[PDB]
């Protein structure tokens, strides 16, 4: 059959705290109709404020990706959107009782488990993909983010931290997500920060909820987390996780390759905005036969 749009089969709930705000938040994921996309909903407000998870609604990109509408924000959407992208979820309502998505364990692991526990549901409309037709890039200083054509979906990333826990380590990685490798390869890679920064961060209303329970905390000469890493390359894998979530602000799954070099949320957003304006560089495609498509998906 054709590759169909997907939504959630049943309502999913989670409780947590925002990484940056420290505020307790109740998360509710709900099914949504065809061509809704992912829409965030601030249900603590009356009337509610609904913000589509689209590039056009990105405000700040300092230490997270923040959606904005009116005076209202939804902060730190990248890890939940990475889970949505990784599982191929087209349509969903994401209700929040506060201004930031719960950080959970710092990865997309809890989200992919909660979603897959409930299950997905295929919808009777063709899934739409954005296919990269020619190279699109943005740079700022030594940072760079690039889309190149690729028959599938692949993400590569390189970091360069002038830090003794990073020097001499694997700071580059490439993952092919044309099959069902997202869950195994990157979903559990945790966010990370530096103990040295915590006073400055907190003064900016950042990392107020951060701890070893939801982040890899890096001290001057060692990782603070006593229990160890989930992957020897967990840092660069998390950057890949972030990129997948930020890229999903395009509103559809990508057929192409992303390469990040010391990039982050700000440059990811700039890349999407120039791609969207550069219309000859991309097209929208569907697949009436899943067997002939370049990306394959798990059963719902
Ligand atoms: C932007 C990033 C990273 C986001 N993040 C994550 C964690 C912390 C962060 C957490 C805890 C910290 O210290 C806790 C502490 C301090 C003293 C003693 C004990 C314990 C410091 C810092 C800060 C921060 O900004 C991203 O994942 N966005 O999606 S990233 C990886 O792309 O830089
Ligand atoms: Cl950046
Ligand atoms: Zn992250």
From Swiss-Prot:
Q: Which GO terms describe its cellular component?
A: membrane
Q: Name one GO biological process term.
A: lipid A biosynthetic process
Pathway of action: Glycolipid biosynthesis; lipid IV(A) biosynthesis; lipid IV(A) from (3R)-3-hydroxytetradecanoyl-[acyl-carrier-protein] and UDP-N-acetyl-alpha-D-glucosamine: step 2/6
Superkingdom of the source species: Bacteria
Reaction(s) catalysed (UniProt annotation): a UDP-3-O-[(3R)-3-hydroxyacyl]-N-acetyl-alpha-D-glucosamine + H2O = a UDP-3-O-[(3R)-3-hydroxyacyl]-alpha-D-glucosamine + acetate
Q: What GO annotations for molecular function exist for this entry?
A: metal ion binding; UDP-3-O-acyl-N-acetylglucosamine deacetylase activity
Which positions does UniProt annotate for Zn(2+) binding? Answer: 79, 238, 242
Keyword hit for Lipid biosynthesis: yes
Going by the UniProt record, its keywords in alphabetical order are: Hydrolase, Lipid A biosynthesis, Lipid biosynthesis, Lipid metabolism, Metal-binding, Zinc
Q: Indicate the residues that form the catalytic site.
A: 265
- Top EC class per UniProt? hydrolase
- Cofactor(s) named in the record: Zn(2+)
Q: Which InterPro entries match?
A: Ribosomal_Su5_D2-typ_SF (IPR020568), UDP-acyl_GlcNac_deAcase (IPR004463), UDP-acyl_GlcNac_deAcase_C (IPR011334), UDP-acyl_N-AcGlcN_deAcase_N (IPR015870)
Q: Does the keyword Lipid biosynthesis apply?
A: yes
Identify the EC number(s): 3.5.1.108
Q: Which family does it belong to?
A: Belongs to the LpxC family.
Q: Which NCBIfam families match?
A: lpxC (TIGR00325)
- What PANTHER family does its record include? UDP-3-O-ACYL-N-ACETYLGLUCOSAMINE DEACETYLASE 1, MITOCHONDRIAL-RELATED (PTHR33694:SF1)
Protein task = Catalyzes the hydrolysis of UDP-3-O-myristoyl-N-acetylglucosamine to form UDP-3-O-myristoylglucosamine and acetate, the committed step in lipid A biosynthesis.
Q: What is this protein called?
A: UDP-3-O-acyl-N-acetylglucosamine deacetylase
